[PDB]
Structure formats: C-alpha cells, structure tokens
C-alpha cells in the first residue's frame, strides 16, 4: 500500500536535482512502503492509455534532469536484513532497499559485524540504485572494482510492472543491463551487497607534484600493486599543481605495521619534498568525509547552487595531451583526477568505458556563483571546450553520467555493438520507453 503525493514540496523536489538546472515537474510523487508498491505503479503505467513516464529518484544528485519524469510520476525511493555470511561465496553480503543510502548501508553493516562493502563513492548521501544505475566509483574501484562489480544479485521492478529477481545464474540479461544501465531496464528495489570485515582506521595522505608525467606514472604504478594502498585518487591544485590522495586502511592487528608499510610505499613516489600530509582517522570519518564538506557549504549557502559537472574517461594514452590542453589550456573548483584497470569492470554491463586497459576519471567539480546565471553559463562554455578539444584531437574519451541526447550521440557513445545490445534490452524490459526517461534515450 503505497502514497501517491501531489504536497507542492514533495513536486517541487522531484522537480529538481544537484544539477539545479533541469526542472520538468511530475504530476505526482509516489511513496513506495515495498517492491509490490512499485510494481503495481510501473504496471498501472505499462497498462495505461498514454503511457505516463515513471522515475525512480534517489537522494537527487543528478547533473541534468536524469531521474525527472515530466508529467509523469516520480517514485521517491528514499526491518531491515542482517549482513548474511555465505560458505559457497567464502564471504559476507547485505540485502538492502534500492533506495537506501550508503551512509546508511554503512552504519548498519559496522553495527551488525563490523562488516563494510569493499567499493565506494566519494559521497556517502548517494542511493544504492542511483550508483549501480551508474558505476560507483571513488578511490578503490582500481582494485576492488566500481560498485557494480561488487553487487550478487538484485530485484528489479521492469517496464512492464514485473518484479524479477536476478544475478550472474538468474536473468543474466537484465542484471547485467541494469548495471550502470541509466535506469532503463527497471528500478532496482533490492540490492545484495558485497562486503568485508571493515577496517577500524585510516592513514590519510597527500602529496604534491608540480610535474604531470610525474604524477601520473605515481598514479599509474600505484594502481598497478598487489603491499599497496587501498584508495588512490587525485585532484588539480590551483597555485597549478597535482595532488596524489592515498589511504592505508587498518585495525587492532595490522596497527603495528601501518607506519612502516606508509614509509615504504611513500619511498618509492616522487612526489615534491615536504608536501606530505597526514590525517590518522577513524574508517567512518573518512568515508563521510564529503558529508563534513557539505554541511560547511550548507552554512555558507555554497550548496544549493548549479553544478555544471563535467564527467569524463579519458584513456591513459591521450592523459599527457588532455593536460597542457585542458588543466593549463582551457581551464588556465574541485577538478578530479585518478586512473582505474578496466579488468575490474565487467563488460557483460551496460557500463561505458574506454576501449583501453588503464583510464583516468576526470571530474570537473564546478560549481557556478550563487544567484548569477552568467557564472553556469561561462562553466558550461568551459565543458564545451573540453568536449570540442577531446573531439579536435580524437581522444576516445567517454562521458560517465552522460548527458548526452541526440540518438545519433547515443550510437556514439555506446558503439555499434553495445548499442544494439542496449536498443534489444529496452524493447524486452520497457517497450513503452517509460522508465528514466528524463536520461533522454528512448521516446514512446
Ligand atoms: C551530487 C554528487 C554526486 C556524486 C558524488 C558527489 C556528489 C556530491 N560523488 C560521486 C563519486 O565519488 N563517484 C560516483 O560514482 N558518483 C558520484 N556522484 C554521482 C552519483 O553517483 C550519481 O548522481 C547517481 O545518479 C546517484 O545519485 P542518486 O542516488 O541521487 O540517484 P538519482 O540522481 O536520483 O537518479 C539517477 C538515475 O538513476 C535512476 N534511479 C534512481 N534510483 C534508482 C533505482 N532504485 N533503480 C533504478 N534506477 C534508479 C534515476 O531515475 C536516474 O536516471
Ligand atoms: O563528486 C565527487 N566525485 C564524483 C562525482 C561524479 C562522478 C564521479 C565522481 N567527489 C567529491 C570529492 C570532494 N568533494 C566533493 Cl563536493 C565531491
């Protein structure tokens, strides 16, 4: 027995998103209790006249209107399961609502086993069907893989209101294209969640480089190990500069070598003499770190301002050309920077990565000056240009969370090949084109 919402609040936030640019408002906003209430609203619109479009919204992070249903119905999907331990696994796992955050995910795994999934985003205030519509990616996906490499199974809610459990065994088709699928195959209500024994604490580290190849030959060896770090990221300094962010994660046993294995891996860096920085805090504390961020922002009235994020994977052979063209070039806020191993990613998914074995994310943070459209505006001909210099020069570059459009675009994007796996997925799991259509895929 679900809620069907028309409170101008509730309209109003499902009009909107982090983004705060795109704004097509539902006609109403549904409160699900469980699946069935879910099943029953994607069957009514499956079933109906005109087909209402139907979105499932997470915590609302999108950059460009992808969980908006324009005239249509937004599902608002954010006791609970115990972390389960399985012998023919040979580890644990968590059945969680689709809609739940990480940060909640978290706290309940810590506080029933001292348990954690293995992968992360660097935002915890994120839902677990919003990033595995995605990828989920932060600082360990290099070695454990995005969030949709470490995920067993799911129940997903398709186009025609049918609720199907599936894994790797079961429907293969539609759990592999619902992974990092854009919400196009169905909404995702149960997620069961890959975990380890959490580590207690982390050495936080940053170092700085002034040399490019420098810095990204750290990078590109330290994703190579495995003694290693379990979370290697890095991010563009303005005087420009480039910071390499490492973790060594540890608990009660690993405690009396944590400073030894750091100075070992550290010796054999090259970052710049005297610009290491150290934090030593609890594993919680650092995984929230970007929630600490926010609520700072939120104070100063710096959150609730438009976000004309740029995405990009960008193939580690073009890397040293998108530099002196983009970081020194284009751009002269927070731009991201770290390489990942494309084995850890399964190509059964709908995810689109370059066609290389080692690419860097590069997330261009921006965000535009409160109340002053000219400043989004001026950010959004900034990502053009970086678009158009990844096109000048044919840098096979892809777009995590695209924006994209154009069906043409689309073709582009995808390939030829995973295209057509894509087109014949849609006909099979929402024909009708009812689901995400905000993403800008499919049309009825
Ligand atoms: C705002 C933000 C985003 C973000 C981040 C930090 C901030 C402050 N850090 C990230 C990081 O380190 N790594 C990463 O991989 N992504 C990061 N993001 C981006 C974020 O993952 C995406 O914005 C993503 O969409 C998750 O956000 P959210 O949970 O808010 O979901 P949504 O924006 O409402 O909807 C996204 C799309 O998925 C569909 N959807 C939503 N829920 C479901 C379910 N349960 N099942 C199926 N599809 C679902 C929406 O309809 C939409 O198309
Ligand atoms: O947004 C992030 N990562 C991200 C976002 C979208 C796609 C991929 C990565 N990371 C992040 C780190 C520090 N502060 C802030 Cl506000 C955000």
């Not at 972390?83 to 059945?95: E, I, K, Q, R």
């Not at 595995?132 to 360990?140: F, H, K, R, T, Y």
């Not at 040293?320 to 990613?345: C, Q, S, T």
């Not at 969370?401 to 090949?417: D, I, Q, V």
Request: hydrophobic content about 40%.
């Amino acid at each position: 027995g679900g809620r069907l919402s028309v409170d101008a609040s509730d309209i109003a936030e499902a009009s909107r998103d982090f983004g705060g640019v795109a704004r097509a408002e539902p006609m109403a906003v549904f409160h699900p209790r469980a699946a069935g209430d879910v099943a029953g609203l994607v069957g009514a619109a499956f079933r109906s006249a005109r087909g209402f479009r139907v979105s499932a919204r997470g915590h609302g992070h999108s950059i460009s209107g992808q969980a908006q249903a324009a005239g249509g119905v937004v599902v608002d999907m954010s006791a609970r399961a115990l972390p389960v331990h399985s012998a023919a696994l040979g580890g644990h796992y968590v059945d969680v609502w689709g809609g739940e955050l990480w940060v909640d995910v978290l706290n309940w795994t810590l506080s029933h086993g001292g348990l954690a999934p293995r992968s992360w985003t660097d935002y915890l205030y994120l839902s677990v069907g919003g990033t595995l519509s995605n990828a989920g990616i932060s600082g360990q996906a290099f070695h454990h893989g995005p969030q949709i490499s470490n995920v067993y199974e799911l129940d997903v809610v398709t186009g025609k209101g049918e609720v199907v459990t599936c894994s790797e065994t079961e429907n293969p088709d539609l759990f592999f294209g619902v992974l990092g699928g854009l919400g196009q195959f169905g909404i995702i209500t149960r997620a069961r969640i890959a975990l380890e024994r959490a580590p207690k604490r982390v050495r936080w580290i940053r170092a700085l480089y002034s040399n490019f190849s420098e810095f990204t030959a750290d990078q590109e060896r330290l994703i190579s190990l495995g003694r290693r770090f379990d979370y290697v990221e890095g991010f563009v300094v303005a005087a420009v500069l480039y910071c390499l962010e490492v973790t060594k994660n540890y608990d009660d046993e690993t405690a009396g070598s944590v400073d030894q294995d750091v100075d070992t891996l550290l010796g054999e860096l090259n970052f710049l003499p005297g610009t290491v920085f150290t934090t030593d805090l609890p594993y919680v504390d650092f995984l929230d770190r970007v929630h600490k961020a926010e609520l700072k922002l939120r104070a100063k009235g710096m959150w609730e301002v438009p976000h004309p994020w740029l995405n990009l994977f960008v193939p580690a052979s073009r890397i040293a050309d998108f530099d002196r063209g983009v970081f020194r070039g284009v751009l002269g806020g927070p731009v991201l920077i770290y390489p990942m191993n494309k084995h850890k990613w399964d190509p059964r998914s709908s995810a689109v990565t370059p066609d290389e074995e080692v690419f860097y994310l590069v997330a261009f943070l921006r965000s535009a000056l409160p109340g002053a459209p000219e400043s989004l505006e001026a950010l959004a001909r900034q990502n053009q240009r970086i678009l158009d210099f990844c096109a000048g020069t044919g840098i096979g570059a892809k777009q995590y969370l695209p924006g994209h459009k154009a069906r043409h675009e689309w073709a582009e994007h995808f390939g030829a090949a995973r295209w057509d796996r894509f087109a014949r997925l849609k006909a099979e799991f929402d024909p009708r084109a009812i689901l995400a259509a905000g993403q800008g895929i499919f049309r009825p």
